[PDB]
């Protein structure tokens, strides 16, 4: 079946993996460490530079947060299906009865888009307004203009200063604060875009919701997206699993392809 | 762009622009040359704009020789200061060029290509220029 119709960017780029604890407390954080070890056992299984750049360990172990940069070819395309809540059903490390508690953890997967650092004050979009200042100074305030008042036409930010006497000392601070808002307003719209995206992938439903559940009683590793249940927790929650994501990747082609 | 990697002194007196060139007045590498018809301090900005003008015309191929080098620092006092308080800061570097110098040379390129590339490069320079081709007079030097 000609798998050669739909296009996608980002599939080959590099991805961030943000794994956090969810429902469960200290034992939930424990399983967040079990999940990361899996994405580190499997990222070695195709030779991918998995860097650790932020984490917060749990008291009894694991990771309350753990944020990683997984570099290589095809990183995001392989792992984009790991985003959501992964549920556990096991006997905790913090109980001597052997009663089973159902906890969950969360995983975020973001491809990096050639990041930032780019804009710098170019004149075609700046209308500069000059005129006379306002306040003390004598006959010089009256005569010499010296109050620079710039207007950034595309973004609308208008920072306007009169502090030093020369409009050119005033030109300096006017330019040096327009940038501090051209950068502030872009860094907002990008981190406002970083919280609207991340809030969806993790899903507040980290009690029990989206992706997978891992049975430690009978070993039923199941993905509720399709259905496929199996006993490969030994071979998956203790190593790689690049072949058991294939149906989640294959059933997601025929999801888009057949319609 | 072009500027010395290091120097003995940061700042240099302005000097003068008398006379025809001391040397560099004959084609020495390529097939065609761009000769300066009037004196000036040629900025590294102007040099590099002429260069980019030529490679972007050739698109791929040819060889350009830049025979002038901006080693002379250019000094300017900050805007709105008064006279005195020392010499201004170095803002750039220039190549002193006098009438008769071969500034650029091209090779590996057709005549019409060489004529056109050097013409466009002449438009990037603050002086009148003349296009020349290698001669026996040049080879005899």
């Amino acid at each position: 079946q000609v798998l050669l119709l739909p296009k996608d960017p980002d599939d080959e780029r590099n991805a961030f993996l943000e794994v956090r604890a969810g429902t469960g407390g200290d034992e939930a954080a424990l399983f967040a460490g079990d999940l990361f070890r899996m994405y580190s056992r499997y990222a070695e299984a195709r030779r991918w530079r998995v860097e650790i750049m932020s984490a917060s360990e749990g008291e009894h172990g694991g990771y309350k947060e753990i944020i990683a940069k997984i570099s290589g070819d095809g990183v995001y395309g392989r792992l984009k299906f790991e985003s959501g809540g992964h549920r556990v059903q096991r006997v905790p490390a913090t109980e001597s009865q052997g009663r089973i508690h159902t906890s969950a953890c969360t995983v975020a997967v973001m491809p990096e888009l050639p990041d930032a650092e780019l804009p710098d004050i170019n004149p075609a979009d700046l209308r500069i307004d000059t005129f006379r200042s306002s306040g003390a100074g004598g006959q010089h305030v009256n005569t010499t203009d010296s109050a620079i008042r710039i207007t950034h036409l595309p973004t609308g930010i208008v920072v306007e200063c009169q502090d030093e006497r020369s409009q050119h000392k005033n030109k300096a601070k006017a330019l040096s604060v327009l940038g501090a808002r051209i950068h502030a307003a872009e860094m907002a719209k990008r981190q406002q875009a970083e919280a609207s995206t991340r809030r969806n992938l993790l899903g507040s439903g980290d009690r029990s919701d989206r992706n997978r559940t891992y049975n430690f009683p009978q070993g039923r590793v199941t993905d509720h997206r399709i259905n496929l249940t199996l006993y490969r927790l030994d071979e998956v929650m203790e190593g790689k699993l690049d072949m058991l994501i294939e149906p989640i990747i294959q059933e997601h082609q025929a999801d888009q392809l057949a319609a | 762009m072009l500027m010395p990697r290091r120097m003995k002194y940061r700042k240099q007196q302005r000097g003068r622009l008398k006379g025809a060139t001391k040397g560099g007045d004959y084609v020495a590498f390529g097939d065609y040359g761009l000769v300066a018809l009037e004196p000036a301090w040629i900025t590294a900005q102007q040099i590099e704009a002429a260069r980019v003008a030529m490679v972007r015309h050739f698109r791929r191929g040819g060889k350009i020789f830049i025979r002038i080098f901006p080693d002379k620092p250019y000094t300017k006092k900050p805007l709105e200061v008064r006279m005195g308080k020392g010499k201004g800061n170095v803002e750039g570097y220039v190549a002193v060029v006098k009438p008769g110098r071969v500034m650029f040379e091209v090779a590996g390129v057709t005549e019409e290509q060489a004529m056109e590339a050097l013409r466009i490069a002449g438009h990037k320079l603050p002086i009148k220029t003349k296009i020349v081709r290698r001669d026996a007079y040049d080879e005899a030097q």
Binding site: - | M1, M7, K8
Partner: protein, 100 residues
């Protein structure tokens, strides 16, 4: 310079370093040229005055180490982008006095 260098076929440029050569010879014996086979030159290979086949009665008057031709890489717009974004370190001033 007889022949077309293979480097030229690959896009290069034949830099004709010497278009003549200095020679001791008799006036009755003056050749009109000296042929040079440059077709073997890649980017970037070079020929020297030692590689010159001299006709009878003519003697090389420069060091045979003297290079006479070279095939160089061509100008390329693809390099402009890296050259424009290439940052230059500001010139260092050579120290005088208790600094040197």
């Amino acid at each position: 310079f007889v022949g077309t260098p293979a480097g030229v076929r690959a896009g290069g440029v034949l830099q004709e370093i010497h278009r003549d050569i200095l020679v001791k010879v008799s006036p009755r014996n003056i050749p009109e040229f000296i042929e040079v086979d440059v077709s073997g030159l890649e980017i970037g290979d070079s020929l020297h005055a030692s590689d010159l086949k001299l006709p009878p009665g003519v003697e090389l008057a420069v060091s045979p180490e003297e290079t006479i031709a070279a095939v160089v890489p061509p100008e390329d717009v693809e390099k402009l982008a890296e050259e424009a974004a290439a940052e230059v370190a500001e010139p260092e001033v050579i120290k005088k006095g208790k600094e040197e």
